[PDB]
Amino acid sequence: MSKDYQSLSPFELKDELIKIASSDGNRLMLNAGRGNPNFLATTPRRAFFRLGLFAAAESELSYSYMTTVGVGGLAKIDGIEGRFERYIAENRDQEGVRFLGKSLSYVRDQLGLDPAAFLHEMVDGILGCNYPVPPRMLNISEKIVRQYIIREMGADAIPSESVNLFAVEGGTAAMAYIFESLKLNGLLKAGDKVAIGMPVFTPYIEIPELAQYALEEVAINADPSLNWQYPDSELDKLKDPAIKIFFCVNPSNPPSVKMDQRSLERVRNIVAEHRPDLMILTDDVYGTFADDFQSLFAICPENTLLVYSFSKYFGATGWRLGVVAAHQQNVFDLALDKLQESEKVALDHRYRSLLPDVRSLKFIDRLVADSRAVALNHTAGLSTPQQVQMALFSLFALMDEADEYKHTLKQLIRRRETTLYRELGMPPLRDENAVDYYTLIDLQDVTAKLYGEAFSEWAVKQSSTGDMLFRIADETGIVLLPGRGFGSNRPSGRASLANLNEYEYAAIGRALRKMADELYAEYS
Amino acid sequence: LFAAAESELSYSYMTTVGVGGLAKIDGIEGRFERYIAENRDQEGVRFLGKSLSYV
Amino acid sequence: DELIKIASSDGNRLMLNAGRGNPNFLATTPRRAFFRLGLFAAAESELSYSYMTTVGVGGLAKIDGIEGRFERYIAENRDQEGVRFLGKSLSYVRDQLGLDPAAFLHEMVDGILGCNYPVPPRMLNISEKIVRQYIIREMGADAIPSESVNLFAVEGGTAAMAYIFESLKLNGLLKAGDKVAIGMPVFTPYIEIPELAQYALEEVAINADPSLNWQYPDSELDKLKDPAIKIFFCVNPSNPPSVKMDQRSLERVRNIVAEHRPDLMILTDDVYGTFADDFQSLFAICPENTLLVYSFSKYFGATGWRLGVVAAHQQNVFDLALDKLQESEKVALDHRYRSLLPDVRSLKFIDRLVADSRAVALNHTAGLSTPQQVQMALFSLFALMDEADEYKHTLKQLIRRRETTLYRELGMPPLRDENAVDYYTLIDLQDVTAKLYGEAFSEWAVKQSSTGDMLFRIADETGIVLLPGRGFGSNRPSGRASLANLNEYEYAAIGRALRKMADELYAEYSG
Amino acid sequence: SDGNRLMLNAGRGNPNFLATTPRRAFFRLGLFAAAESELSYSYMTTVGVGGLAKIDGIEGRFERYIAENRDQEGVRFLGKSLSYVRDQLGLDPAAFLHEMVDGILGCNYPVPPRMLNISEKIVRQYIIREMGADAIPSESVNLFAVEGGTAAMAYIFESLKLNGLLKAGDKVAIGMPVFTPYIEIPELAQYALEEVAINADPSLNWQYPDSELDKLKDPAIKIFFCVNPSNPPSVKMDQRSLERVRNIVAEHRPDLMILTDDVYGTFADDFQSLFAICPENTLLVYSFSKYFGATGWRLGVVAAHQQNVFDLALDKLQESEKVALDHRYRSLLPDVRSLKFIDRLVADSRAVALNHTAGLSTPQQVQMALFSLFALMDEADEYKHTLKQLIRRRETTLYRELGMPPLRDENAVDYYTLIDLQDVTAKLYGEAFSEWAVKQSSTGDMLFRIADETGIVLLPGRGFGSNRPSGRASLANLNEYEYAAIGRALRKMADELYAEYSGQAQNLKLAAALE
Ligand SMILES: *Cc1c(COP(=O)(O)O)cnc(C)c1O
Ligand SMILES: *Cc1c(COP(=O)(O)O)cnc(C)c1O
Ligand SMILES: *Cc1c(COP(=O)(O)O)cnc(C)c1O
Ligand SMILES: [Cl-]
Ligand SMILES: [Cl-]
Ligand SMILES: [Cl-]
Ligand SMILES: [Cl-]
């Protein structure tokens, strides 16, 4: 397939290169531009499996008949704290159990929630024996996860009670649901313009283009000379009232830098002074990998729909865990109040089965209903075991006051960067906005640092992206994404610093150094 | 629980937080067989062992 | 001399006889890992012995199926620290270095049993790959392709220097009368060796300047431009001053080699590097001109293990110098190494170190014992796997705590800068007296005492012998302590003794 | 193959057996030591950092470790070790335990450098017993621990040169045949010594004839260099030979230096070293490699008697030579004329100035002391008998189809065995055939046939001067089916030589019946 990559003829060369890839991880980058982590948070997963064993015993205590097979009943909330405290006490030597005991203290003692309700939500939830209720998100899991979201998005000033979440099957489901609900509710109409922060991976460029949404894309271009920050002139394009929504991945993918303070402030001022109606849709999956991250959701909560995925930070791509966050008073609901009477009446009919007064149905709840064709709203929602795992990842981050996990992953990314660039003039100079979950390996910069500016200009002209990607693939079996495009004046390639082990980054550096040495030998 | 151990066998660095790597397919039958042999008294484990035979 | 007499102890004797402070701390996790690995290996060996007997006899461990058996041992012992470390080690080698896991485990098991001669003799295959990653990292030599670094495992830096001077002489790279520039001050043994009649080298001092916090001035380093100086011999971080060469200094040498002395040999002893902040070796700066000697002794608390390596870049000035010898010298060398290989002119200097270490003919049974190479690899893994440098911070904080305890009654520790290492610390009478009672008093006090009075007195009240101050000359009463070999109350006792002496000096002076 | 290459490159067979009890005792001692270190570390920390073990109270703590681990083989051995050192050698038990604990942690430089104090006393008891040197008071023997016999020979030749005991052109008598490395070292240009062969006689079963030993009476021969038991022949010098050397030293050459390598002594029956016969004239080199299957550990010792011919020769150097040595060794002590040769070996091994940090690593010395204790405490020699029976089992397997093993006498060692075609064919088909087969065949065809069918390369039989097709194998480095394959290949070859001899004979008869 290779959609992201493609986005003796030159075409067939590209096809041959794609065929070299041999791992699911390499193919995921070529097809969809995502780096699947090869690390994962184990403590909250062990806590999840240990909670399940406790829950299985709680279920068997509720089965009343002598049975030859394993059948259980529903766990009881009465007496649950004491039974859970016995389980904790009998298993102090099991890491997952110790984590569960601390998480109960955090929720009961720091969040101030009902301990038996928490334990029962977690036990019944991990048994997966009841439909999610309410469908938008389990009650205590929502309060736990939103504390995590607010902290990592740098949105401390927003009172936590003003934030609501819809738990979904990763950012992948969130985007599918959000675009469908914006169309269904007349918030995005045929011909409307969608401003997109670019560069961005292909799936997000593609969604608005679907014929089912007659949308026009307007590029808000990141500037390489500014280390991929969006210049004020680009951000100012958001002033055109024709742009109904600003769609952004922050930290970005592929550049992998977070928006700096100047950029965030610019957007905040454009919104307060010129576009109080602007809808913002931001995907902040990489936030925790940045230093002192602050989301567009923290800056303009009333105008932003935040999409947060747990996939990359917790190494949970296969768990499909995400949330859509909205402030209680937002521009989407303001926009719904402004629809023409004809659209409002059609929506009264569409959601009539949900509640008496549809005009009072908030957009975040329309997302839930639309995700399952409305009529099935009562059985909608993310599975309860998924919500439980999501809550345990959240508690793991929240209870780690010194951010040990976050520091561990950031040092791992830097260690890999050093290994990759060792033989290429060392890692590129970083700054406070660098995230580097993805890295751009530029031929001009590498050859310059190694043999000087003059050799480098002769080198890029002598070479090509295709040449570079082929030499690396042929020697290591790893196919990098084209950094700029096969026709570029500056041959470059991109790799994720999350999906390979050190000797593979070393091999890539060695293949590239070798190519640089042979070019210089010729230039000698 | 077996998979968490498999993931931790793939983590290369010293750390005080629990971090694991991707589980390896090489030698997996042997490690699974050891897990099964050591936990013959746990109901879930006997079931996993028979599942392998069925498949 | 008189000091050892009034204060007898192995620690004191070592300080005066060898100018070294033996660490009183040691890395234990990789040691427990070594002993646990040994228990696994003993069981592997016993199961390879085919006959029944009550006697403890074992056979050779088998490589086939070794990973599965090792994984069972790890899974069965999650509660033994040494075993968990071994489990992480397997992943680091398999997953981060990308080396064959069965080969790594068999090299470690076979190696700890010590049942086979080291092969190749220069260094076991996988231990070399593991240890060079550790060397490259701590020497701050990241820009050097690691496949270009080769190592010869030796019985500590002590064996390294002996091997190196003998091989440089035997191969005509350092002839009697050649000038050797030495970074001074340096401890006595390095002053003495080049001057043995056996080598008869002429020493040229590159003097560290106390007024620059013991860095070498550009004027001193420029002496290297003199072509008669064939080699620059340096301990960095230095012993006794204990500071690392600053950026200005390393760049000065790099320019000299690049612009004036492409042929200069460099021999650097960087055993204290890990105790410095952001250390960078001359090997990282001039890899093709430098023979690096690295000892595991001080950092790991492993003086008794005798673990060291000699590192060389695959393309280096020593082999260029071998290529530039006169043909008649080459012919003599062909006859010397004839038994080793058909084409002696292709024999690299690092492989000559190995052969010369055991009189050439015994080359195939030369090299560091295999259990020593296994322990060296485990110390190296322990540092590589410690991404946050926790062990390093712990030792640095321990050094600082001792320094604070030592100087508490002496005006506090001397102002530290980015190049400070302080494995050895200078206690200067004038400086201490100045901080306590004023420069006026310190100029007087200094004429009232002397290095000998100071040392004899401290040794008599505390049982501790300091190294006499070296580097200024003699003009200044002063002594050096190691912050690595004593416990807190002993540093407190030294400070107490010096303060009392300062207080008596002041009592007089005041009246 | 590495084992095959070792035989070809170094002329030695690496054992495939090893002493495990003393190794388990070493790893268990280490775990005890690690906990001792951790208890001397005073600060809370996340990483494993330890302090130095304390001697105060060490016996009680060690006794608790022993009592709590009665089920671990290594631990029982350790407990008996303490009794042996304390109750039989009469040494300080706390000092012994602290030397072993601090030693195995490898946290202090070896002191004194020549050898740890207690390890030296323990190892010399073992050396004296296995070398058959009991008549020598053990206090009269000093040892220098080194990195195997390999390091010993390098240090010894270098020290003999540096101190002027052997000068260019001096003659060195060498017991032959001997393996290659020892013929090559004396001829290096850096030594330039003249070699004089002392040839073992195959008709004397590889013993040195008196006429050969008598070559030592030549005053120009400064040293006799011998490997005993020998390699490659693998026989120990008999009583007659030892006595001949003893009489020559006593009557004609009181000044003769003897350098003997006795690594194979424990494989011989009732071994006696030249060191036991002429202690004052001999430097003994003993390696632990072969007997304990410890080639990778590199454990060796150089042994010298307190009063020896080496120090006498240093006292007889020209005053000009002593003045130069006064300068070489000045940093070590004030009276260089009192520095004994065994201590110059130590200083010279590390360029003199690094003397105080010279010496074998302490964990190596601890392992060597445990191998020594294991042998000393094995009163009935069970380990030795076990190894000898394994060697004999392999020998039986090798020769089963070759007419059974050759007749062994009281001087046989057979760590290496000589497969002599003349003997094998005589045993299979008679002397007449045997006399004919020795003329038809060659060592080269023997080695090629075996290598061709089995993958195993043997060493050519050396020492004969009358074309005797033969090859040598080590009985220490292969498994039974490999020795069986070697025997099968040889039997096949003997059968083809026989069919041909038989055919020629029948033809000779038919040809005559036609005339
Ligand atoms: C990796 C990635 C995600 C995660 O999507 P999920 O469906 O939640 O796994 C989201 N957005 C971007 C830009 C990504 O690169
Ligand atoms: C302590 C130290 C060493 C270590 O020598 P080893 O033989 O390796 O124990 C080396 N050089 C210097 C300058 C040191 O002070
Ligand atoms: C096997 C062997 C040795 C052992 O040498 P090390 O260096 O001690 O391993 C010594 N001498 C001879 C003749 C040998 O055959
Ligand atoms: Cl657990
Ligand atoms: Cl179960
Ligand atoms: Cl342990
Ligand atoms: Cl044991």
> How far from chain centre, in Å, is Cα A292?
17
Q: Distance (Å, rounded) from C-alpha A423 to C-alpha C90?
A: 26
Location of structure tokens 């929720």: A107
Size of interface B-C (CB pairs under 8 A): 42
Q: Distance (Å, rounded) from C-alpha A257 to C-alpha A217?
A: 22
Location of structure tokens 């928490």: A118
Least Cα distance to D232 among D473, D483, D487 occurs for D473
Q: Assess C385–B contact: CB distance below 8 Å, yes or no.
A: yes
Across the interface, of D34, D189, D363, the residue whose CB is closest to C32 is D34
**Bond prior to C240 in cis (omega within 30° of 0):** yes
- Say whether A400 and B17 touch across the interface (CB within 8 A): yes
D265 lines ligand 3 (CB under 6 A): no
β-strands A321-327, D470-474: how paired?
A: unpaired
**DSSP reduced 3-state for A169:** strand
On whether the CB atoms of residues C124 and C118 are closer than 8 A, the answer is yes
Residue A201 alpha carbon, nearest atom of ligand 1: 13
Which neighbouring-strand residues pair with C233? C182, C267
Q: Assess A417–C contact: CB distance below 8 Å, yes or no.
A: no
Q: Assess B1–C contact: CB distance below 8 Å, yes or no.
A: no
With a CB cutoff of 8 Å and minimum separation 6, the contacts of A461 are: none
Residue A170 alpha carbon, nearest atom of ligand 1: 8
CA distances from D303 to D2, D119, D125, D256 (A): 31, 14, 12, 17
How crowded is residue C445: how many other Cβ atoms within 10 Å of its Cβ?
A: 23
Write out the binding residues of C for L-aspartate.
Answer: 98, 239, 480
Q: Distance (Å, rounded) from C-alpha D322 to C-alpha C219?
A: 42
On whether the CB atoms of residues C203 and C226 are closer than 8 A, the answer is no
Burial class (CB in 10 A: 0-12, 13-18, 19+), C159: buried
Contacts of the segment D392-400: beta carbons below 8 A, 24+ positions apart: D393/D480, D394/D475, D394/D478, D394/D480, D394/D483, D395/D475, D395/D483, D397/D480, D397/D483, D397/D484, D397/D487, D398/D473, D398/D475, D398/D483, D398/D484, D398/D486, D398/D487, D399/D424, D399/D487, D400/D484, D400/D487
Which neighbouring-strand residues pair with C467? C480
Which neighbouring-strand residues pair with A283? A249, A307
C158 lines ligand 2 (CB under 6 A): yes
Contacts of the segment D194-199: beta carbons below 8 A, 24+ positions apart: D194/D169, D194/D170, D195/D171, D196/D171, D196/D172, D196/D221, D197/D173, D198/D173, D198/D174, D198/D224, D198/D226, D199/D463
**DSSP reduced 3-state for C298:** coil
C242 lines ligand 2 (CB under 6 A): no
Chains D and A touch each other (3 or more Cβ pairs < 8 A):
no
- Phi/psi-derived region of residue C114, left when phi > 0, alpha when psi is between -120 and 50, beta in every other case: left
Residue C294: in which H helix or E strand, if any?
Answer: strand C290-295
Which neighbouring-strand residues pair with D25? none
Rounded to 5°, the CA angle A421-A425-A431 comes to 75
Q: Distance (Å, rounded) from C-alpha C414 to C-alpha D478?
A: 65
Q: What is the 3-state secondary structure (H, E, C) of C194-213?
A: HHCCCCCCEEEEEECEHHHC
Length of chain B, in residues: 55
Residue D89: in which H helix or E strand, if any?
Answer: none
With a CB cutoff of 8 Å and minimum separation 6, the contacts of D510 are: none
Q: Distance (Å, rounded) from C-alpha D344 to C-alpha D156?
A: 10
Q: What are phi and psi of D204, to 5 degrees?
A: -110, 20
| Complete edge-to-edge strand list for the sheet that includes strand A216-221 | A163-169, A321-327, A304-309, A279-283, A243-249, A193-198, A216-221
Q: Distance (Å, rounded) from C-alpha A299 to C-alpha A293?
A: 11
Location of structure tokens 């310059």: A448
The amino acid at residue C341 is: L
On whether the CB atoms of residues C171 and C322 are closer than 8 A, the answer is yes
Q: Distance (Å, rounded) from C-alpha D247 to C-alpha D255?
A: 13
Q: Assess C158–D contact: CB distance below 8 Å, yes or no.
A: yes
The amino acid at residue C184 is: M
**Bond prior to A134 in cis (omega within 30° of 0):** yes
On whether the CB atoms of residues A317 and A36 are closer than 8 A, the answer is yes
Q: Assess A151–C contact: CB distance below 8 Å, yes or no.
A: no
D290 lines ligand 3 (CB under 6 A): yes
Q: Distance (Å, rounded) from C-alpha D191 to C-alpha C336?
A: 11
Length of chain C, in residues: 511
State the angle between helix axes of D21-38 and D58-68 in degrees (0 to 180), rounded to the nearest 10: 120
On whether the CB atoms of residues D177 and D462 are closer than 8 A, the answer is yes
Least Cα distance to C437 among C340, C378, C506 occurs for C506
Burial class (CB in 10 A: 0-12, 13-18, 19+), D135: exposed
Least Cα distance to D300 among D128, D150, D497, D468 occurs for D150
On whether the CB atoms of residues D103 and D365 are closer than 8 A, the answer is yes
Q: Distance (Å, rounded) from C-alpha D450 to C-alpha D473?
A: 11
On whether the CB atoms of residues D206 and D472 are closer than 8 A, the answer is no
Mutate to test the interface with B, among C28, C72, C90, C390 (most CBs of B within 10 A): C72
β-strands A243-249, A193-198: how paired?
A: parallel
On whether the CB atoms of residues A369 and A377 are closer than 8 A, the answer is yes
How crowded is residue C464: how many other Cβ atoms within 10 Å of its Cβ?
A: 24
Which neighbouring-strand residues pair with C243? C420
The amino acid at residue C317 is: V
CA distances from C295 to C133, C300, D352 (A): 15, 10, 19
Shortest CA gap A517–chain C (Å): 13
Residue A369 tokens, joined: 């209903």
**What structural domains and CATH numbers belong to chain C?**
1-19+389-511 (3.90.1150.10), 20-144+366-388 (1.10.20.110), 145-365 (no CATH)
List alpha helices for D378-455, DSSP H.
382-399, 421-429, 431-440, 443-454
Q: What are phi and psi of A359, to 5 degrees?
A: -60, -20
- Phi/psi-derived region of residue A20, left when phi > 0, alpha when psi is between -120 and 50, beta in every other case: alpha
CA distances from C379 to A191, A314, C295, C300, C303 (A): 66, 31, 12, 7, 13
Across the interface, of C55, C302, C336, the residue whose CB is closest to D106 is C302
Rounded to 5°, the CA angle A201-A203-A208 comes to 115
Find the C267 Cα to ligand 2 centroid distance in Å. Answer: 14
Residues of chain C numbered 63-122 and touching chain B (CB < 8 Å): 67-68, 71-72, 74-75, 87-88, 90-92, 95-96
Residue C158 alpha carbon, nearest atom of ligand 2: 7
On whether the CB atoms of residues C164 and C291 are closer than 8 A, the answer is yes
> How far from chain centre, in Å, is Cα D52?
35
The alpha carbon dihedral of C206, C210, C212, C213 has a sign of positive
Least Cα distance to C477 among C442, C444, C452 occurs for C452
On whether the CB atoms of residues A217 and A205 are closer than 8 A, the answer is yes
The amino acid at residue C185 is: P
Location of structure tokens 């940093």: D331
Which neighbouring-strand residues pair with D49? C27
The amino acid at residue C461 is: E
Length of chain A, in residues: 524
Q: Distance (Å, rounded) from C-alpha C489 to C-alpha C178?
A: 48
**DSSP reduced 3-state for D499:** helix
Q: Distance (Å, rounded) from C-alpha C75 to C-alpha C158?
A: 40
Which neighbouring-strand residues pair with D474? D416
Q: Which residue of B has its CA nearest to A48?
A: B1
Q: Distance (Å, rounded) from C-alpha D152 to C-alpha D159?
A: 10
Q: Distance (Å, rounded) from C-alpha C7 to C-alpha A56?
A: 70
Q: Distance (Å, rounded) from C-alpha A308 to C-alpha A397?
A: 15
Shortest CA gap C97–chain A (Å): 5
C271 lines ligand 2 (CB under 6 A): yes
Q: What is the 3-state secondary structure (H, E, C) of A95-135?
A: HHHHHHHHHHHHHHHHCCCCHHHHHHHHHHHHHCCCCCCCC
Q: Distance (Å, rounded) from C-alpha C434 to C-alpha C455?
A: 19
Mutate to test the interface with B, among A28, A42, A415 (most CBs of B within 10 A): A42
Q: Distance (Å, rounded) from C-alpha C226 to C-alpha C260?
A: 9
Residue D330 tokens, joined: 């000045």
Maximal CA-CA distance, chain C: 89
With a CB cutoff of 8 Å and minimum separation 6, the contacts of D339 are: D329, D332, D333, D347
Mutate to test the interface with C, among D349, D354, D370 (most CBs of C within 10 A): D354
On whether the CB atoms of residues D285 and D293 are closer than 8 A, the answer is no
How crowded is residue C417: how many other Cβ atoms within 10 Å of its Cβ?
A: 11
D150 lines ligand 3 (CB under 6 A): yes
On whether the CB atoms of residues D50 and D38 are closer than 8 A, the answer is yes
Rounded to 5°, the CA angle A54-A57-A63 comes to 150
Residue D355: in which H helix or E strand, if any?
Answer: none
- DSSP string computed for A56-88: HHHHHTT--S--SS----PPPSTTHHHHHHHHH
> How far from chain centre, in Å, is Cα D88?
27
Least Cα distance to A305 among A278, A269, A339 occurs for A278
* Closest ligand relative to B41 C-alpha: 5
Residue D157: in which H helix or E strand, if any?
Answer: helix D148-162
List alpha helices for C60-146, DSSP H.
66-76, 81-91, 101-113, 125-138
Half-sphere exposure of A323 (CA within 13 A, CB side): 27
Q: What are phi and psi of C319, to 5 degrees?
A: -75, -30
